[PDB]
Structure formats: structure tokens, C-alpha cells
Amino acid sequence: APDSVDYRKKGYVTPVKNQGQCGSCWAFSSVGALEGQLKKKTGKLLNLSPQNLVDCVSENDGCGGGYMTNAFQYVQKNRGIDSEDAYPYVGQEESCMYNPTGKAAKCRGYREIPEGNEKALKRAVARVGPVSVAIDASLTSFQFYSKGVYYDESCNSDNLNHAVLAVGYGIQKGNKHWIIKNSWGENWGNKGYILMARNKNNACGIANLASFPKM
Numbered sequence: 001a002p003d004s005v006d007y008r009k010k011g012y013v014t015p016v017k018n019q020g021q022c023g024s025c026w027a028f029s030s031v032g033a034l035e036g037q038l039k040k041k042t043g044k045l046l047n048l049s050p051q052n053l054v055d056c057v058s059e060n061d062g063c064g065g066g067y068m069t070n071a072f073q074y075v076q077k078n079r080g081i082d083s084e085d086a087y088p089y090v091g092q093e094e095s096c097m098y099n100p101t102g103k104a105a106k107c108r109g110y111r112e113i114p115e116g117n118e119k120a121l122k123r124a125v126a127r128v129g130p131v132s133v134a135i136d137a138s139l140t141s142f143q144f145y146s147k148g149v150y151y152d153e154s155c156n157s158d159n160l161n162h163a164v165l166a167v168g169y170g171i172q173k174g175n176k177h178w179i180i181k182n183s184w185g186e187n188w189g190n191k192g193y194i195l196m197a198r199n200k201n202n203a204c205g206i207a208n209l210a211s212f213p214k215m
């Protein structure tokens with residue numbers, strides 16, 4: 001495994017989105033992971049639909065919150081997820097209106113990464129690619145973050161409240177780090193991204209609830 005990885009360069013990462021006034025971060029996390037497998041699978045970097053997930057994933061709560069695992073599971077038994085086009089995002093949950101002809105990807109199951117192991121996570125990201133993760137994002141530093149390797153001592157590993165997307169890792173001046181994609185706009189953090197501390201004892205709980213779809 002390399003000492004550096006960034007799937008932004010290789011082309012596994014689409015543009016940053018905004019979830020708006022809805023708790024759909026678990027959707028944008030699931031869609032990111034799915035997108036990344038696509039580019040590897042069928043060379044195409046398409047923008048999937050976080051809204052199809054919001055409305056149809058009955059095991060979740062939609063704008064109230066949910067798990068990525070449920071969202072991947074749904075994409076399997078329902079045999080498919082659309083392109084943003086066939087189900088654009090309106091940040092309002094609504095009655096399920098999935099569309100066969102829309103279909104732009106599918107996944108056959110999901111794998112969960114060993115709870116709390118950042119060594120397994122670095123490997124999953126080096127070998128598989130973009131991985132869905134959860135984190136504690138209540139800290140005010142997180143919202144006002146602007147540059148550098150993020151680390152705050154009040155980040156609770158047991159209070160996962162936001163889902164995000166890990167798309168690589170590397171080291172900035174002696175400080176190892178996870179490269180994270182957020183769904184809060186490009187006007188947040190560093191152009192929609194944040195460098196989170198790595199190896200520093202499960203910072204914020206980044207390796208506690210991580211997964212990826214199988215294609």
C-alpha cells in the first residue's frame with residue numbers, strides 16, 4: 001500500500017453537493033461510495049441520486065436520518081438506483097417514485113470495515129477506493145474549519161452524528177490525514193473538503209462505522 005492516495009486526481013470523485021435543511025447526509029455518503037465504484041467498474045463517473053434513497057429507503061427516516069448500510073441494502077433488493085436526472089434532489093422527503101429507465105448503477109451487497117481499525121480503513125481505501133464513514137461533527141471547530149489537519153480533543157468517538165466520504169489519505173508536514181468529502185457546500189471548509197487527523201486514536205470516530213458497496 002502507498003504512503004499516499006487521492007482518488008480525486010484519478011477521477012473517482014464527483015462535485016460536492018449541499019444536503020440543504022434535511023438530515024440526508026447518510027444518502028450523500030452512500031451515493032459517493034457507489035459513484036466511486038462505478039468509475040472503476042464501467043469507466044463512467046456519473047452523478048447518482050441521493051433523493052431516490054431518501055424517499056424509497058423505508059428502513060431509514062429520510063430527512064430525519066439513517067444508516068448507509070440500509071441504503072446499500074435497498075439498492076440491492078430493489079435492484080437499482082437512478083441518475084440525479086431521473087430523481088433530482090429537492091431536500092424534501094417525498095413518496096417513492098423510482099424509475100427503471102433511469103437506472104444508472106446497482107450494487108450487489110456491502111462490506112463493513114472492522115470497528116475502530118484505521119489500518120483496515122487505510123487498506124480499504126487504497127485497494128477498493130472511496131469509503132462511506134461517519135463521524136462526530138458537532139464541534140464548532142469542524143464547522144469553522146478552514147485549512148490543515150483537523151484535530152480537537154472534544155471529538156467523541158461514540159457520538160457519530162454525521163456521515164461523510166473518505167476518498168484518500170496522505171501526510172502534510174509530519175501530520176498524517178484522511179481526505180474527507182462533505183455535503184455542506186463548497187463554501188464550507190476547504191472547497192467542500194476537510195483533512196482529518198489519522199492514526200491519532202480514532203479521531204472523532206472516523207473508523208467506527210465505515211462501509212462500502214460491492215459491485
Ligand SMILES: *[C@@]1(=O)[C]N([C][C]([C][C]([C])[C])[N]C(=O)O[C]C2=[C][C]=[C][C]=[C]2)[C][C]1[N]C(=O)[C]([C][C]([C])[C])[N]C(=O)O[C]C1=[C][C]=N[C]=[C]1
Pocket residue numbers: 019020021022023024025026027059060061064065066067068134135136137138160161162163184209
Ligand atoms: C445526517 O444528515 C443523516 N443522519 C445520519 C445518522 C448517523 C449516520 C450513521 C451518519 N443517523 C441517524 O440519525 O439515525 C436515524 C435513524 C436510524 C434508523 C432508522 C430511522 C432513523 C445524521 C445527519 N447529520 C446531520 O444532519 C448534521 C449534524 C451535525 C451538526 C452533527 N447536520 C448537518 O448536516 O447540517 C446541515 C447543514 C445545513 C446548512 N449548512 C450546513 C449544514
